[PDB]
Structure 1
Amino acid sequence: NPEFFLYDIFLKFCLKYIDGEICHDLFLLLGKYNILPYDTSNDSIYACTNIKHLDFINPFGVAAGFDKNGVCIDSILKLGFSFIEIGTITPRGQTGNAKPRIFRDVESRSIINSCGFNNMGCDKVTENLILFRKRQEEDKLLSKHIVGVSIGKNKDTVNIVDDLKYCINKIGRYADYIAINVSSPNTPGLRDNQEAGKLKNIILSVKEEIDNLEKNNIMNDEFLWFNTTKKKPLVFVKLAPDLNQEQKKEIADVLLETNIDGMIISNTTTQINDIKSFENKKGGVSGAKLKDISTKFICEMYNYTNKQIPIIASGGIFSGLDALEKIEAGASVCQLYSCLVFNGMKSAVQIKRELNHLLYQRGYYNLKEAIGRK
């Protein structure tokens, strides 16, 4: 598309001279007004992937934390992504930690963020998603695209489950899947919720709350779910990389026994100390410096779960091979974040071209044949 490249011109200017979040807000503004490029091409039927009954037309979506409020869904999905994970959201709106709270290092293709959970709140974000679903039923470029919702807790929330209830009971019928965020490093004591006992209780409650919306309705299931699948939203868990294996195997044993629908592996880390520009700066780091670390976590959990729980790759994906390495490790789908930051509009068209070519060269009939081939 000719107009993909114009935004690559501005991109270097932005990376070198403009504050990251200002660029991020700008990005969202362009999408709000549908001034982003489009990728209307048919996707390779050899790359169409699925997570249980959730059928992704291609294995690439946009990770959570990008459109934390669903004010930019149409445009981002129209860039060429098969799905998007909005959020993470909390019941009430938050302003997050103080700015500046996002810092890019172009040289290492790395990011550090101390955003917290700044969002417009569950209620208002739900209205934004309703607007989208009503446009989706009227736009053919969106008819097959999927929208998941990452959910979390407010800093002052006492019981995480209470916040999981409100959001599920408010937005569950419009979402295609729920992502359980118990892994953000920028919320105090949030990663202590990954202890097996409570995470078990967390998963069961999420599944239960989603299961409870179906019972009390007079309308059939078709008109209950105003989403893409017309089906109950699947439940995925978001995991942090900064854990020991004892914690990982505990989690793995739990999510098998509680029948989680999936697990997003992985999230940002606080243990990276090989970035000079981020010294004395709080938050979790994203990008290339997390690529290798995450892929190994996938292998671990993919093995700790005996391949019985699907995975959603997330961390350091920039190239088609980067994705394949994570696909061959056990991931069914991949999410990108830093890639959009450093590559811009050509992110989807680049990583989809690259992956198709590699699948062809490596001798694979389809993507599923590559799952766990390592």
Structure 2
Amino acid sequence: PFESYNPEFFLYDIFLKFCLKYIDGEICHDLFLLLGKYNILPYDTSNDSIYACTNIKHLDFINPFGVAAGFDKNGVCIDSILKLGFSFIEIGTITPRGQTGNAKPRIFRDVESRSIINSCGFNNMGCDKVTENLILFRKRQEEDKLLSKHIVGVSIGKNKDTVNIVDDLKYCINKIGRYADYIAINVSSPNTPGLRDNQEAGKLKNIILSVKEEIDNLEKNNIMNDEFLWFNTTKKKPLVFVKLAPDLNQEQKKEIADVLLETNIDGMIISNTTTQINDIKSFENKKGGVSGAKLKDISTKFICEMYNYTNKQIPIIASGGIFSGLDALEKIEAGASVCQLYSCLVFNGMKSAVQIKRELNHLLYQRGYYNLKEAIGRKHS
């Protein structure tokens, strides 16, 4: 861990736990984003093992760890976050018009249980301004050969007061879609009234098909233009993922799986935050969704259920409680092709990607796997 740029340089751990103990979470997160905006975060100088690469269709992840949605909501420090050692980032969730979200305080951390609860409310600058931030990343990427394989997806949602979610989803596709490697459809935030109701099978089917049709029309209507349409990493139209909430009964889970099979979604993000956790004293009488270690078992079990309900035909992006290489292998053996981190960055900080990639690599050795892909879904059978 040699010199200031190394993500494991000893000072970052001391700065981090001082922050966790004494500094409001909103301030800590703004500080992290400030360091990133001015490109003074440490960066991972390692070249990733080829034996831990993974793919979802034509998306070739250089390593299996990305940053989950809601961390860089406005796409203002994509480069710096990726250079910590992540292979991709999901920016968003964005909405057509900007919004400041719900009233504060709305973030609360519990270091002891490595857990967060939040009622943020899709605070973002709006689709149009976030699109400009992503365009600036894409121009830098075009000229920095070292970012040319990193992936950026965009999570899209609805403004709090919109009546038909589909209008807002189409609006985002038509402005930011051409710059995205994939689109994550967010029907699972706990903090926008009515949003989770769109996980009902009938509504969800119409949402998926409208989104895919809007993406396919983007292509049709611009194939012939002098500027190439897909200004992203893949140079292809974005894949479509759905992000699911873990607070569903089994019948809802089965009915959603049937819809995902029929609509040919490209992947599912399992899962968003949970409202079911009642046993954290810090968070008593607090509203919102719980992230972190106490979401791990819940979301891993959800991965197993959905891998089997979709008969292993729908690739899985794992989110929830991932801090260690063992955590990550649990998600992968459960059915996931790739992992997203959020809480790990809050409680482990700058070394998050370095550490968990090293832990996973050693673990793939100790368990005799030739590569990560061999481990996907191996819990089953």
- Structure 2 vs 1, CA of residues 123 and 299 (structure 1 numbering), >3 Å: closer, same or farther? same
- Structure 2 vs 1, CA of residues 327 and 218 (structure 1 numbering), >3 Å: closer, same or farther? closer
- Structure 2 vs 1, CA of residues 231 and 22 (structure 1 numbering), >3 Å: closer, same or farther? same
Identity of aligned residues (%): 100
* In 2, Cα distance between equivalents of 1:201 and 1:25: 37
Report the CA distance between 1:219 and its aligned residue. Answer: 4.2
Aligned length: 374
* In 2, Cα distance between equivalents of 1:182 and 1:218: 30
Asked whether the equivalents of residues 210 and 232 of structure 1 are also in contact (C-alpha less than 8 Å), the reply is yes
* In 2, Cα distance between equivalents of 1:213 and 1:150: 18
Is 2:28 aligned against 1:19? Answer: no
Aligned to 1:308, the other structure's residue is in SS state coil
- Structure 2 vs 1, CA of residues 127 and 243 (structure 1 numbering), >3 Å: closer, same or farther? same
Asked whether the equivalents of residues 295 and 325 of structure 1 are also in contact (C-alpha less than 8 Å), the reply is yes
* In 1, Cα distance between equivalents of 2:146 and 2:346: 24
- Structure 2 vs 1, CA of residues 235 and 218 (structure 1 numbering), >3 Å: closer, same or farther? closer
Q: Which residue in the other structure is 2:92 paired with?
A: 87
Is 2:278 aligned against 1:265? Answer: no
* In 2, Cα distance between equivalents of 1:153 and 1:139: 34
* In 2, Cα distance between equivalents of 1:129 and 1:152: 17
Asked whether the equivalents of residues 51 and 310 of structure 1 are also in contact (C-alpha less than 8 Å), the reply is yes
Aligned to 2:40, the other structure's residue is in SS state coil
Unpaired runs of 5+ residues, structure 2, are 1-5
Aligned to 1:71, the other structure's residue is in SS state coil
- Structure 2 vs 1, CA of residues 34 and 199 (structure 1 numbering), >3 Å: closer, same or farther? same
- Structure 2 vs 1, CA of residues 12 and 247 (structure 1 numbering), >3 Å: closer, same or farther? same
TM-score (norm. length: structure 2):
0.97
Report the CA distance between 1:99 and its aligned residue. Answer: 1.1
Report the CA distance between 1:315 and its aligned residue. Answer: 0.2
Is 2:145 aligned against 1:140? Answer: yes
* In 2, Cα distance between equivalents of 1:2 and 1:107: 23
Aligned to 1:185, the other structure's residue is in SS state coil
Asked whether the equivalents of residues 204 and 258 of structure 1 are also in contact (C-alpha less than 8 Å), the reply is yes
Aligned partner of 1:209 among 209, 214, 222 = 214
Report the CA distance between 1:222 and its aligned residue. Answer: 8.1
- Structure 2 vs 1, CA of residues 79 and 299 (structure 1 numbering), >3 Å: closer, same or farther? same
- Structure 2 vs 1, CA of residues 11 and 83 (structure 1 numbering), >3 Å: closer, same or farther? same
Aligned to 2:247, the other structure's residue is in SS state coil
Asked whether the equivalents of residues 151 and 167 of structure 1 are also in contact (C-alpha less than 8 Å), the reply is yes
Report the CA distance between 1:2 and its aligned residue. Answer: 6.7
* In 2, Cα distance between equivalents of 1:61 and 1:187: 25
Aligned to 2:301, the other structure's residue is in SS state helix
Asked whether the equivalents of residues 8 and 351 of structure 2 are also in contact (C-alpha less than 8 Å), the reply is no
RMSD of aligned residue pairs (Cα, Å): 1.1
Report the CA distance between 1:141 and its aligned residue. Answer: 2.3
Aligned pairs (5 A) from 1:101-112:
101-112=106-117
Asked whether the equivalents of residues 221 and 230 of structure 1 are also in contact (C-alpha less than 8 Å), the reply is no
Q: Which residue in the other structure is 1:30 paired with?
A: 35
Aligned to 1:46, the other structure's residue is in SS state helix
Report the CA distance between 1:218 and its aligned residue. Answer: 5.2
Is 2:337 aligned against 1:332? Answer: yes
Report the CA distance between 1:5 and its aligned residue. Answer: 3.1
- Structure 2 vs 1, CA of residues 218 and 201 (structure 1 numbering), >3 Å: closer, same or farther? closer
Report the CA distance between 1:189 and its aligned residue. Answer: 1.1
TM-score (norm. length: structure 1):
0.98
Asked whether the equivalents of residues 268 and 317 of structure 2 are also in contact (C-alpha less than 8 Å), the reply is yes
- Structure 2 vs 1, CA of residues 312 and 221 (structure 1 numbering), >3 Å: closer, same or farther? farther
Report the CA distance between 1:40 and its aligned residue. Answer: 2.4
